Structures are given as C-alpha cells and as structure tokens.
Design a binder for this molecule. Structure first.
Ligand SMILES: CCCCCCCCN[C@@H]1C=C(CO)[C@@H](O)[C@H](O)[C@H]1O
Ligand SMILES: *[C@@H]1O[C@H](CO)[C@@H](O)[C@H](O)[C@H]1NC(C)=O
Ligand SMILES: [Zn+2]
Length: 1016
C-alpha cells in the first residue's frame, strides 16, 4: 500500500540535482533583463479569439520585524496600510489586495470596533481582500524546522478560520532567501492547490524560463507516483518590486510604479520617472506596458498572465492608493477597449490567477512539467550567495530549537486534561505558540534583523519559555498527584525545569542546585517527561549540594548513579590561559532515567554521610604544562595532573575514542576487534575580502579557504566515569567537549567569538571516507537531500543549510553529524564535513540591513557524531536524489531535539506523589512520532476534541531484525472517544470519518493529522 521511497527513482521533467550538474552558471549581461536575454514575441500570437488575460495583483510586503520591531512597524506602517486598505477596498469595488502575514492582521483586527470588523469581513467575503498562505508569518525555508513551519501556518489559518471564515488554498512566498520542497509537502497536506515562489538563483530563473518550466508540479524527491505534487509558479525576475514585475525591462516597469513621482520620497534609479496617465499619453503608455506584458507572457505556457503590483510596506498613504488605482484604471480602460492589443487586463487576486491558469490547462491549452529538488543556495547576483544566514545570530537559532521542543512538551502535557479557565493554560500556550511562530519570520531565525530587533525576538522567546515551564510544571503536578489529594493553586510553582543544555554552561549559571543536608532536607523528588511515543532511557544530570547522594525510583529500587565535579571554564586574564575551575560547593549527579511513551517517571535523590553503595565517582585528569592544584570541596577523589598527551576512552560496550594531545578527536573504534577509523576534529577560520564585496548577515564571501585556528598549548580536562566520560579543551573562542555515554558521542561547543571582527569559526571533520563530491544535508528536519559539490561554483555556493543533520558515505562507511541548532555547512573535499559555529562581521553587505553582525554572545552548540558501517544497508541507487538515516542516527537526532524534560519538586514535601504516568501508552515503532498533540477545545465544550500530527520517517534497513512493537492508535489515547477523523495538518478540515474510531498509522515519509472527539 505504501510507496517505496528508496528503490524507485522518480521520473520527472526537471530534477534539480541533475539540472545543477548540467547547467553553466555563467553570469553574462543579458541587456535590460540583466540576467536573462532580449525577449521576442510574435505579435500575431494573441488575436480576437485568443486574448492575453492579465491579472494585476496589488500587494504589500510587511516584515514582522527587520529594521524595526514588529510593534514599531505595526505603529509606524502596517496599521495605516490595513486601515486604508479597508477604506479603499470598501469604496472601490473592483480594486483587489492580497495579504500574507496574519500576525499583523490579527494585531490590527483586534484593535477594530465592531463596525469596521463587519466591513472587513464583507470585503473578504466578496473577494476583494484575499489572504494568501495565511501563516502567522512568511517563514524562512532554510533554518526553520518543519514542525515550526506547521505551527505558524496553523496559528495563522486557525485565526483566519475563526474570525474571517476563510482558509487559503494558494500560497505566496516572495521573500524567503531560497526555497524548500518542505513547503509544498506541508501545504499539499493542508488543503493547498497552488503556491508561488520568487528567490531562486538567477541562473535557474534563466534556465527554466528558456524552457517555459517556471510553472511546474513540484513533487517530493522520493515520490514515484506524484501524489505529493503541488502546482507551483516561480516568478521570473530579480525582485518582487514593481520595476521587476511588469516585464523584463525595469527602466520601463519603474515608470508604472506611481508612487515614484517625488512627493513620496521614492524615485526611479533608471532615471525615467512615472508620468500620470492622461487621455494624451495613454495610448503611448499602454503600448509600452502591453509590450512588457507580452514579453513576460512568452516565459509561460497559458494565455493568463500574473503581474504582482507592490513592494515593502506599500499601500500606506491614502494618496498612494489613489495614485496606483486611478492610473491603472486608465490603462485598463484604454487597453481593454483597443482590439489590436488583444488583451483583457484587470485587478485580480492570486486565487483568480491560478483558477484561470487551470481553466486554460483543462481546455488543453498547456501541460505542465514535473519537478523535484530544492532552490538552495540562492544568489541574487554575481557570486553573492546567501549562505551567511544559515549561521548568523546562532544563539537565537539554538533558542528556536529549544523553544520548539518546550512548546511541543507544554501542549502535550497539558492536553491530557481539560483545564479550568482560571488555570490560564490556553492563554500561556497561545502566547508561546505566537512568539515561536513570529520568530519563523525570514528575518527572525535567519539572524538578518537589526540588533534591537534581535533583542525583541529573544525577549519574546524568553517569555514563551517561561509560559511553557508554567504549563508543563502545573501539568506534571496534576498527572502525578493522587486525584483526591490534588490541590492546585494555578499561580504556584510546584516544579522548576532543569535544563543542562540551555542556555548552557558558560552562557548562564541558570541551573538551581538541589540543596540536601542532614539538618535541613534529606531527599528530593525529580520527574522526567518523555514527549516521544516509545519507551526511552536517557542519562540525566542534576546539581546537588553534596557528593554523597543516591538515587531510587518510586518503588524504592536503587538506581546506579555517577557523581562528577561541576567544572566551569574561565579565560584567566592573569595567566593568559583558558582553564577549568572546579566547584567546591556543588556536584553533578548522573543516572539513567527510564520513561514511558509520552509519559512521566519519578525518582528520589537522598543524601547520606558517606559514599552511597550505588553511586560511583568520576576520576579527573587535567593535562597541561605547569599545573596548579584543583581542590573540589568534599569530592572524594583527588584530581590528577600530567603534561598534554594522546588519550583514549571507552564507556560501556560503546566505541573507543582516541584524542590528540590538544583534546580533539582523532579516531573512533567501533568494536573491540574493529579498526581505529580516522575521524579528526579541527577548528578553522574564514576571513572577509579587503576589496570587492564584504560578507554580512546574509552573504558569505570568504577570502579563500579557511586557515587553522592556532591552538597554542590548550588545557585539556579528562573526566572518566562508569556512566559518562568526557574530554574538554579550552581553545581560542571555543570550549570543545566530547561526551561519551556508551553510544555515539555527544559534542558540545561553548562558542564565544569575542571581539574577533571579520572572522567565521568553522568546525571540520577530516576522514578517509571516499565520498568524492557527494554529501547529504537535511531540509527542515524532515528529509535528507543529496548534494553534489561543484567546482564550477565558488566555495560559498557549496554551503547549504544544516537545519538538523549532514552525512557523507562511501560503499562501506558513513559519518553522520546531527545538530541541536541550524547552522551552515558543506563538504569541501572528499571525506570532509564542516559546519560554521559563529561569524562576526564588521561591514554591512548591501541588502538593506545597514549594519554588520557585531552582537555575538556565547552560545552552546550541541551535536551527535555517528560513525557507522553501511555496506549491508539497502540504499537508494546512484541516481536517486534522497538519502535516509539509520536507526542510530535518527535516535541521536531525537536526543538533541526532544530530550527528556527534567523537573525538580520545589517545596520540601510532595504529598500524594505518584511514580509514573503513561505506563499503558503504546510504544510505537521507532520511525513513528507524535509530532504534535494539542487539545483543541476549551473546558466548556460538551464534545472535547484533541488533535494529533503523526509523522513516520524512513530508516535504512541494515539487517537488524529489530522488530515487535505496538500499533499506536491516537484516537484511543483519551477515554470516551465518540469519533475519530483524519484532517488536514492544521486540523481545520475533516477529510475522512474513520471506521471503529481508529486512526491508522502512516507510511514512511508521510505525515497525517487526526482529531479524536470525546463526550465530556
Ligand atoms: C537590495 C535592496 C535593498 C532592500 C530595500 C528594501 C528592503 C527590501 N525587502 C527586504 C530586504 C531584505 C534583504 O535584502 C530582507 O531581509 C527583508 O525581509 C525584505 O523585506
Ligand atoms: C463561512 O463560509 C461558508 C462557505 O463554506 C458559507 O457558506 C458560510 O455562510 C460562512 N459562514 C458565515 C458566518 O457566513
Ligand atoms: Zn521580507
């Protein structure tokens, strides 16, 4: 029943990796269409029986923060554009306008009196104002996780369904810096029929236009059948502004932007201004414009022509509405009434355009090509590739992934019950979803906003994190307290969250210490949550006030623990070294938590006065010349010292890792008998060009290949434990840590680029894997796409988004690097992988930001590194454009994105405490996830509804029998189910009423949504 996503190479007309291999990329002057050619048309193509139908579609691009904050733009610009849109559309019935950004529309609509709300609904209802896409924002497509692209789409479309009674089926994405097939994937599963994109490489626009392949059915790279396909229109020219939307010649098009005559402080840089259309000039002006239109129409297959009309924060002034509308109405009246043009032009919406295109298709007038692949990495001109923003402001890129998971955890934990309105659960969840959704903006997560705007986004996300913690800790307290004893105050903190990796050590001493003592408090309850739908074990750590601490579960079974020191690293401006200080007042306890599917498990930490039986202590070795002592308060094991030397480590049965005398990995040995496979970590730096174009927040323009960071004689700390060992090294700008818990290691980098202007720090892996020019990166955490390094393209063009992982392989061996944050990366030579850590840029890169990137702050980046043998795996064939993770690599990714959550009970005694929740939840097959669980009704609703999004990835078969699991039916997760429906992914439309109230699982690479209904 399921399509095979590995063994059948789809046959498509345009496959982007194939196309890239053949294309030339030469940047030649095409004349007035600088990046194309002089377009020619046959004037007899259009006649009385076959007219060119032109839809002029007014629009206004509103960034939800960029050079101003969201609120500053809203106050200064967007409230005026929307207010005047309402008035001018109401007063002028044939005028049309499209609107994309629902965050702004919702901000506006709730400031409206009821009379204006009714006026607004009627212009939507009558088709004059039409929403396109309807997401909270127009998201970035490179760095964004698919889960947050769906979150934001849902947030906007749920608002529109509720308040406007509409759900867009056409998408408008004119500004993200390059485009991802994740978008048609999600849109086609959310009821969409059409989408439009703009920022694609100038060479690709040229290549597709030549073949009239700018409109295509965009299917996923593994889709043999074509059921994922979504009709897509790619705009043909450099910009979405009016000079680049009427036709190939911007000197002519600029004359039809009526806001550029002088009083608005805008002009035409091609030096010919617009002129008011009058009876005396209309024929001449019409001739000029129709000629542009007929040239643009040559690039497409039907007799229906899309002409966007708009630019940033347009349609603001009343006078601007008038100047655009009246001039265009004069042009339309003359053109439509002059038979010799054979054109019928009118204002239109995006849906009107698509509807007319498909009527032409149905009339047998055109057939469209099929296409798969992506549109990274974008260049708007010459060698200006937009790979910088895959890394810019990496602190916030990491914060995105943290908040992603905390939103999922808060919605899932609180979904199990209906809550009294006084608990304010819905209020806090809506704020969290909205601040996370806002940051998906293509100047948010991208790190392309001004410094004060980045501060706005961070403050909003911090409040979101606080709202998630409040919901989660209230939910835990209810789920784990005997019901007849449960006594909530909805404002109280029952638990606080403890997060080891955010903001992370060296970024903030945020972590509370559990304070225990014979004379104060003997013990403390802790609870772990597991948001994944399978049983999971994972080591968890806490800070405690004594090393003599032991762990039990709630059946009072001893649990094996390990105590280590708390080490922090310091730039000692006295000795000019970066070296570790051990706490004398705090220690770390580590143990394996075991947690049910989508469930909770409670443990207890108890103090004693001597070494507890089931707690071990790590040994610590500080490698450096000229050591000084390192006292550890009560820690029972003295630190040892040595000169720098190679070391090797092995935890459990896991691999054995060897390290250079500078504390960097050199090799991995998978098994006792197996070879020591060379795997070398190295840190290098890129600079900036001294003449020609400068790197900035968007552009990566290196002055040549990277050069090695000079390491000097760094201090190396080795901690060796039965449960966890690690090697940490203080390098310039980076504290680099390799952590071993018995499987693939975890890597943590505390990245502080300091005042190193015009530097980009890269972390590279050097191996002997014979990968050649092939490597794999992911798109939005959803799929892995095959990349080919091309020497015909400059270094920065071979950079791709690494939203969650990358790998290289040959016939026998693969190395996969999974990330806890989106960064930019590449494989610049056979056997290499590399990924940028941070970048500090003193110059602006001429894209409107008006600043470089000089606001860096310490960030803790996290990874997993998985070396595997793959000669037994069933892989796609050489011509297949996709790759797939193994089970180990997928679980390693899950450990970074969705770790166990840790809660510490906040008061002395928790009466009515329970050991576990969710013990009877089905433990689903490892490739299946419950991506979203969200209660969709408030408590007063008679019929409760709960939405689930189910996603199944596809894992390589490498011969692990690995079987027996339980079927997961989400519809029977809550009791008293009365109906089960399959829905669109936004939950807004029912697609199937399901027999037996049973939600079937989905196929590999498919994502489904279900809603269960419950009598209450
Ligand atoms: C290259 C021309 C400078 C831009 C003039 C006005 C802003 C155009 N539009 C803006 C531009 C950029 C980057 O170029 C994006 O970051 C914004 O999100 C976009 O709205
Ligand atoms: C919502 O739109 C539908 C179209 O499905 C229409 O029939 C209905 O009247 C609308 N509801 C309201 C409140 O107008
Ligand atoms: Zn924009």
């Amino acid at each position: 029943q399921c399509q095979d996503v590995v063994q059948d190479v789809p046959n498509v007309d345009v496959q982007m990796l194939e196309l890239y291999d053949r294309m030339s990329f030469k940047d030649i002057d095409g004349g007035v269409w600088k990046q194309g050619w002089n377009i020619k048309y046959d004037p007899l193509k259009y006649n009385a029986h076959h007219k060119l139908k032109v839809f002029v579609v007014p629009h206004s691009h509103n960034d939800p923060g960029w050079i101003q904050t969201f609120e500053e733009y809203y106050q200064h610009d967007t409230k005026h554009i929307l207010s005047n849109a309402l008035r001018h559309l109401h007063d002028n019935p044939e005028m049309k306008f499209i609107w994309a950004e629902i965050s702004y529309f919702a901000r506006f609509y709730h400031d409206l009196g009821e009379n204006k709300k009714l006026q607004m609904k009627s212009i939507v209802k009558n088709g004059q104002l039409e929403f396109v896409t309807g997401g909270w924002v127009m998201p970035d497509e490179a760095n964004s996780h698919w889960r947050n692209v769906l979150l934001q789409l849902t947030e906007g479309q749920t608002w529109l369904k509720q308040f406007m009674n509409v759900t867009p089926t056409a998408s408008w994405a004119i500004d993200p810096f390059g485009h991802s097939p994740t978008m048609p994937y999600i849109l086609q599963k959310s009821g969409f029929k059409n989408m439009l994109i703009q920022r694609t490489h100038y060479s690709v626009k040229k290549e597709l236009a030549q073949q009239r392949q700018l409109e295509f059915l965009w299917r996923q790279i593994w889709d043999n059948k074509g059921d994922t396909a979504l009709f897509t229109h790619m705009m043909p020219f450099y910009s979405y502004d009016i000079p680049h939307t009427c036709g190939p010649d911007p000197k002519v098009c600029c004359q039809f932007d009526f806001k550029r005559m002088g009083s608005f402080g805008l002009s035409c840089p091609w030096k010919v201004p617009p002129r008011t259309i009058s009876d005396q000039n209309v024929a001449a002006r019409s001739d000029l414009l129709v000629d542009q239109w007929k040239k643009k129409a040559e690039l497409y297959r039907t007799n229906v022509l899309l002409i966007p009309l708009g630019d940033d924060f347009r349609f603001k002034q009343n006078t601007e509405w008038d100047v655009q509308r009246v001039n265009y109405e004069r042009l339309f009246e003359h053109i439509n009434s002059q038979a010799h043009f054979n054109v019928q032009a009118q204002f239109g919406t995006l849906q009107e355009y698509f509807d007319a295109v498909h009527q032409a298709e149905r009339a047998g007038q055109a057939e469209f090509p099929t296409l798969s692949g992506d549109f990274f990495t974008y260049a708007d001109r010459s060698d200006n590739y937009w790979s910088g923003y895959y890394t810019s402001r990496p602190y916030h890129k990491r914060m995105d992934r943290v908040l992603m998971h905390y939103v999922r955890a808060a919605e899932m934990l609180s979904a199990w019950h209906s809550w009294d309105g006084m608990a304010r659960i819905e209020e806090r969840l809506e704020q969290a979803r909205r601040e996370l959704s806002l940051f998906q903006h293509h100047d948010g997560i991208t790190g392309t906003a001004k410094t004060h705007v980045v501060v706005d986004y961070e403050q909003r996300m911090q409040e979101a994190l606080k709202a998630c913690q409040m919901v989660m800790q209230q939910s835990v307290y209810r789920l784990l307290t005997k019901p007849s004893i449960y006594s909530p105050d909805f404002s109280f903190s029952y638990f606080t969250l403890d997060d080891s990796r955010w903001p992370g050590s060296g970024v903030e001493d945020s972590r509370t210490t559990i304070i225990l003592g014979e004379d104060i408090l003997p013990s403390k309850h802790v609870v772990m949550h597991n948001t994944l739908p399978h049983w999971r074990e994972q080591l968890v750590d806490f800070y405690v006030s004594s090393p003599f601490v032991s762990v039990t579960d709630l059946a009072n079974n001893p649990v094996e623990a390990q105590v280590s020191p708390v080490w922090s690293w310091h730039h000692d401006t006295l000795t000019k070294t970066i070296h570790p200080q051990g706490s004398t007042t705090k220690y770390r306890i580590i143990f394996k938590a075991r947690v049910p599917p989508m469930g909770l498990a409670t443990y207890v930490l108890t103090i004693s006065d001597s070494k507890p039986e089931h707690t071990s202590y790590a040994s610590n070795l500080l490698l450096r010349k000229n050591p000084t002592s390192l006292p550890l308060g009560q820690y029972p094991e003295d630190v040892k010292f040595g000169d720098p030397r190679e070391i090797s480590l092995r935890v459990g049965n896991g691999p054995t890792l060897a390290f250079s005398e500078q504390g960097l990995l050199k090799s991995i040995q998978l098994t006792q008998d197996s070879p020591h496979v060379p795997v070398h970590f190295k840190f290098l730096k890129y600079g900036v060009r001294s003449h020609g174009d400068r790197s900035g927040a968007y552009l990566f323009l290196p002055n040549g290949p990277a050069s090695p960071v000079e390491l000097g004689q760094p201090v190396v700390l080795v901690t060796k434990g039965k449960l966890e060992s690690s090697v940490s090294v203080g390098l310039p700008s980076v504290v680099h840590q390799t952590i071993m818990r018995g499987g693939a290691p975890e890597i943590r980098n505390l990245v502080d680029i300091g005042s190193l202007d015009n530097t980009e720090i890269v972390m590279r892996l050097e191996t002997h894997i014979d990968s050649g020019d092939i490597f794999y990166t992911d798109l939005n955490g959803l799929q892995f796409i095959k990349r080919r390094r091309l020497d015909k393209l400059p270094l920065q063009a071979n950079y791709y988004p690494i939203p969650s992982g990358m790998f290289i392989e040959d016939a026998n061996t693969r190395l996969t690097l999974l990330t806890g944050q989106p960064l930019g990366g590449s494989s610049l030579a056979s056997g290499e992988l590399e990924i940028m850590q941070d970048r500090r840029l003193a110059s602006d890169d001429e894209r409107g930001l008006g600043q470089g990137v000089l606001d860096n702050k310490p960030v803790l980046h996290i990874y997993r590194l998985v070396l595997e043998k793959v000669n037994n795996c069933v892989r796609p064939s050489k011509l297949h454009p996709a790759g797939y993770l193994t089970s180990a690599a997928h679980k390693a990714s899950q450990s970074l994105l969705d770790p166990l959550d840790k809660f510490i009970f906040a008061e002395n005694e928790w009466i009515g405490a329970q050991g576990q929740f969710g013990g009877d939840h089905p433990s689903a097959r490892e490739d299946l996830d419950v991506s979203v669980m969200r209660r969709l009704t408030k408590s007063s609703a008679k019929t409760q509804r709960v939405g689930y999004v189910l996603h199944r990835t596809n894992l390589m078969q490498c011969g692990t029998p690995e079987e027996h699991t339980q079927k997961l039916d989400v519809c029977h997760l809550l009791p008293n189910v009365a109906r089960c429906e399959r829905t669109t992914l936004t939950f807004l439309q029912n697609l199937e009423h399901l027999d037996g109230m049973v939600a079937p699982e989905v196929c590999p690479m498919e994502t489904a949504a279900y809603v269960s209904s419950h009598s209450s």
